[PDB]
Paper text:
X-ray crystallography-based fragment screens have taken off in academic and industry settings. To assess qFit-ligand’s ability to detect multiple conformations in event maps, we took advantage of ongoing fragment-based drug discovery efforts through the UCSF QCRG Antiviral Drug Discovery (AViDD) program to design inhibitors against the severe acute respiratory syndrome-coronavirus-2 NSP3 macrodomain. We identified previously published and new fragments manually modeled with multiple conformations (n = 20). We used these as a true positive dataset to determine if we could identify multiple fragment conformations in event maps using qFit-ligand.
We created a modified true positive dataset (n = 20) by removing all ‘B’ conformers and setting the ‘A’ conformer occupancy to 1.0. qFit-ligand was then run but with an event map, rather than a composite omit map. In this use case, qFit-ligand models alternative conformations into an event map, which represents only partial occupancy of the unit cell. Therefore, we scale the output ligand conformer occupancies to estimated occupancy from the background density correction prior to merging into the full system. Following this scaling, we perform standard refinement and note that the sum of occupancy across ligand conformations is a refined variable that can be <1.
Numbering used by the authors: 3 to 169
Write the structure that this text describes.
């Protein structure tokens, strides 16, 4: 039993809700919140911009030190950093950005990072400003993640379409 409330159950392990991931994180304080990161951990917009804003830019400060030490992430890769005031940990995961020409096959590799964590709050990878089809992202999530994932979808219209089209 966990504190996630109001989710629709899609499969044994995947749950979905129309919610602002920022507000959801502040309420549950999950062990892991997933960020829709880029390889430079530049949290300018989309989910990342919103999460970072909620940390008063502390996420960005921490991320800049991470990059200075380690260099950029790989597309499809991840790193674990602090969750600041939102969660114990933030799993920064880089899905492919279609608006940069990146290979959509890397979306499966991106979701594989979730399997290293028993329970996660997450957005749909490569959705929004990353330019992928969210219906496809949900399909890859369900077919790749085996741990317990609670998906937050900001747009109500999109949430309803994802549910109504789910196989
Ligand atoms: O819906 C999708 C599909 C893929 C990415 N994506 N976005 C989100 C957004 C979100 N929260 C949010 C929304 C608007 C905001 N403005 N300022 C802060 C802030 C926070 N929570 C979950 N997914």
């Amino acid at each position: 039993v966990n504190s996630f409330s109001g989710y629709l159950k899609l499969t044994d392990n995947v749950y979905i809700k129309n919610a602002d991931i920022v507000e959801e994180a502040k309420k549950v304080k999950p062990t892991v919140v997933v960020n829709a990161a880029n390889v430079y951990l530049k949290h300018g917009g989309g989910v990342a911009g919103a999460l970072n804003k909620a940390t008063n830019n502390a996420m960005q400060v921490e991320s800049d030190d991470y990059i200075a030490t380690n260099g950029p992430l790989k597309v499809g890769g991840s790193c674990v950093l602090s969750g600041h005031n939102l969660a114990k940990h933030c799993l920064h995961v880089v899905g492919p950005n279609v608006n940069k020409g990146e290979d959509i096959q890397l979306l499966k590799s991106a979701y594989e990072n979730f399997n290293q964590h028993e329970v996660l709050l997450a957005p749909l990878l490569s959705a929004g400003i990353f330019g992928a089809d969210p219906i496809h992202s949900l399909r890859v999530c369900v077919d790749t993640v085996r741990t317990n994932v609670y998906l937050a979808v900001f747009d109500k219209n999109l949430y309803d379409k994802l549910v109504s089209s789910f196989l």
